[PDB]
Design a protein around this ligand. Sequence first.
Ligand SMILES: CCCCCCCC(=O)OC[C@H](COP(=O)(O)O[C@H]1[C@H](O)[C@@H](O)[C@H](OP(=O)(O)O)[C@@H](O)[C@H]1O)OC(=O)CCCCCCC
Length: 372
Amino acid sequence: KSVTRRNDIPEAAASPPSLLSFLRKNVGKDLSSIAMPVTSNEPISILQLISETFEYAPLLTKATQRPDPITFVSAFAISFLSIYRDKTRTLRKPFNPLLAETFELIREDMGFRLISEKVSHRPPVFAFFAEHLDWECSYTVTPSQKFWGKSIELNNEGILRLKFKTTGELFEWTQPTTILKNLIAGERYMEPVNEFEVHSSKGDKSHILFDKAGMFSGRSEGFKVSIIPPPSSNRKKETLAGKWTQSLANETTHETIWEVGDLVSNPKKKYGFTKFTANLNEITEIEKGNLPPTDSRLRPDIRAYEEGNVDKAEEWKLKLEQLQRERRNKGQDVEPKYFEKVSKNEWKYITGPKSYWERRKKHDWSDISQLW
Ligand SMILES: CCCCCCCC(=O)OC[C@H](COP(=O)(O)O[C@H]1[C@H](O)[C@@H](O)[C@H](OP(=O)(O)O)[C@@H](O)[C@H]1O)OC(=O)CCCCCCC
């Protein structure tokens, strides 16, 4: 089966507030558990944003069918940055999910399904588990930001663990650091920095290094990828090149490996969302009547905001956070249901008759309370 999607969202209802305003105005001790106005947000939660890591999942599927899978895993690993190609996307942030808030994403068109949940509030910890017939990926991430003085260091702390269900081979990597520049003057934007690597359980390793731009060619967008197989295996060295804002190719044969999809129409007036982004908060035939009470698609503030009601959304954002606060203080902390801690910084999808997907088949959410 298949479903129809909006591939669009209403235009932004308010202009973007300044981030540096909050920084200096809120230095004192130091941010984190400091609230921000709803207008500083884009119409999706962090759970949904991280889900965009899978916009180009077909790359992983193709990887399971190529003698040199790491080159495609490397394309996928870098692909997520493309959502920041239209600078507008860097002007706002996702809504902060409530503890135990969830987000499921089933893309039958791409043959995969994903389930995610906020497993911790302080520090904030998000757990993801994506599934496809030929692969699966788990992720325990903690987004961290650090005011560097004239810019902000953005890092998703955590290892993405990819697994080929075809052969059981494993791939791991941490998403690369990004820097939000032009906090002072000029139009804000983000660009990746330094480098990161994708390591294979079979020894193969991929090294990605982003070009540098400190004061001239504006935003950095190019990058090189050096594939390095284990000297011993029949596999051999390869090289890739491209721009995380457009595409990646095998630089030896100059063949395109990955390309960006489409942004929504008139992106500058719609947070710079890609079409995939715009489809994240839509309730289609897939979700209709199948969601637990905690999915991000059911949040009132995000919904009202998406539909343009600033005041109404602001009312709701304050309400949701206040309620979580009271539950917290009463010690009636809502505990995550679909992931369990396996170690420090590591959560794992709970399997069984009480797992997410099993409960879903029979709408078994009797023990699940409304968070708002
Ligand atoms: C790489 C992936 C990108 C992900 C970007 C993530 C950016 C980020 O989490 O910061 C946002 C925060 C402010 O949140 P805010 O919306 O008011 O969320 C609420 C507050 O944290 C509030 O204190 C809390 O109540 P508490 O009192 O009960 O805890 C509520 O439960 C929360 O809902 O400000 C800061 O910590 C400063 C950092 C600024 C950086 C911005 C980047 C755009």
